[PDB]
Amino acid sequence: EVETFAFQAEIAQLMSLIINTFYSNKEIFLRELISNSSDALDKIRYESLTDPSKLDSGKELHINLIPNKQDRTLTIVDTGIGMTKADLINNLGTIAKSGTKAFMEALQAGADISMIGQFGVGFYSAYLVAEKVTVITKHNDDEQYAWESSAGGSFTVRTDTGEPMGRGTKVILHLKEDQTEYLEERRIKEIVKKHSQFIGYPITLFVEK
């Protein structure tokens, strides 16, 4: 059972701007997704202080970076708080509407795309490098879901039947054909050191077989 939804017009506009604007400094997508993962980890860690059972779905708080040249995917996995179905369809998009508007006005006043994270919508910088993004997520209070969008104004949500996650979020970047440098170990290492050196959780960069 796959459900198809229309993006809010403002988010579709943000996605088109990210996809169509000429802007060479694409590597910042990784900082924005790692920052999102760090925030999700902060949330479950804080909530576990008053309800330790919230970690029954997994004690480890970490971030894994998994490149796969065969599938041409870069996967960012965290064991954070995860997202509910309502998060995927309604809640986060509602919040992102005001952040998108502020970001759009800032860009017109001279900001650049690298400052997208200051407006809370850094996730969508994934489309600087990905033609399709798949998000697998599991929140303690809900089922495991797959969100997916290739832009163009629509996204899908389905119950995920694959390997159970325990808790957290997996962002699968199906990279554009000319963006495969983000599958190279030395390139990912360089970006993490430059932009994500002080993240307060272990970041493991997987090596390819």
Ligand SMILES: OCCNC(=S)N[C@H]1C[C@@H]2C=C[C@H]1C2
């Ligand atoms: O996870 C926090 C960042 N997410 C944002 S800003 N927006 C939503 C769009 C995609 C589906 C749910 C999330 C990712």
